[PDB]
């Protein structure tokens, strides 16, 4: 059950390089990335899934020097996902979303499709023109995806760790993300922990609900 | 099977107000909120869980103006969670986190505790004093929580919908959040869908991996 998963999962501090995802598992992690929800189904994201040694080494270049402890985790894990946000919400993307919803059969009529599109455009424009927060708004959706993904991979019986400890300017350059309209936010190595993962056996810790939670 | 969960869950558009969470489920959703991961275990969040008629009505004040379509979702669901971020990161919070980690048994020695605290302070200060993005950085952690939560509640067999379509100034005012040091970000009604939930039967739609996902 899912509460067991939530209580037992942890941030892996060291991975066993010999233990690879199965082909089935490697497909499943892609499914999780794709099927996360997002505001307006805006899906303002790109994922880099590095499974080869040379692909993982390219991602690991982002932690060289200043984030050396992140470096090893990225090399040892089986698969390493880089979560990227769009840097701007263009109309081409908005049309791509609504056209895919139509292709998938979500609209009974042209009127329903046009209403969907107009609604999405309205809130997108608000973020960009009035709140001046479109980059942050899209980045929030990517973090939501990360949350979904962490729980998902734990439920599959896999180990992971989310990493903000990397140099996004280096990762961005390595993969030419700026020119493509994306920026890297979180790196998540996935695989199986080694005996050197001291965090596998430490108790979890969270603030008590009497501090963080009000019931009304 | 968490992939089945991810592929079958959906954003509920209409709730059956007579179908309440069980007592155990109401505790389980609180566990999911508490046990989300977060950068540095910073846990920069507060949750309001509305389960009474009075409580839900208070939240539903925020479904005004452009956001009236959210109102029924908030009133008819069994339990409505307001996800809030801290508005600033302070040392008092940082000390609370590390002291809890110590109480839970995460540190073998004084030296280990003091290293943990120093590292957390270093990165927290980088956000607040150098990047000037601590509000955004904290809100990102809250969104991660939401993503964990939506998959969690689906895995419990519960329906939910994440809502950004509410007026956060209205909600903040109603619950006195600003003075308490928090701001409302996402509202998530939880319960069971009705037969008038048109989204329960519509196909799910996502962009193809050939657009969103690069393998290396
Ligand atoms: C967005 C995010 C970024 C994180 N960055 C790092 C990181 O760079 N290195 C690290 O060792 N752990 C990292 N963590 C892991 C957290 O310290 C961990 O999630 C937290 O202490 C709670 O522990 P748990 O994940 O074992 O439940 C990060 C977590 C999140 C959510
Ligand atoms: C952060 C966030 C905010 C959302 N805001 C709303 C909202 O105000 N009202 C609404 O009906 N749905 C809202 N949605 C639901 C999305 O439209 C939905 O997640 C998306 O179309 C994907 O469909 P699914 O959740 O059924 O998989 C929101 C989703 C997210 C993740």
Residue numbers in the entry:
A (entry chain B), B (entry chain A): 2 to 217
Task: Copy text from the publication.
The natural substrate of this flavoprotein enzyme is not known; however, it reduces a wide range of nitroaromatic compounds to hydroxylamines and also reduces quinones to quinols, with a bi-bi substituted (ping-pong) enzyme mechanism.
This water molecule also forms a hydrogen bond with K74, as does N71 NH2 in the wild-type enzyme. The longer side chain of the leucine causes slight shifts in the positions of F124 and W138, each of which is in van der Waals contact with one of the methyl groups of L41. At T41, the T41L mutation in the double mutant shows the same effects as seen in the single T41L mutant and the T41L/N71S/F124W mutant studied by Bai et al.. The T41L/N71S and T41Q/N71S/F124T mutants both have a slightly lower redox potential than the wild-type protein. This is most likely due to the N71S mutation, where a direct hydrogen bond to the FMN cofactor is replaced by a water-mediated bond.
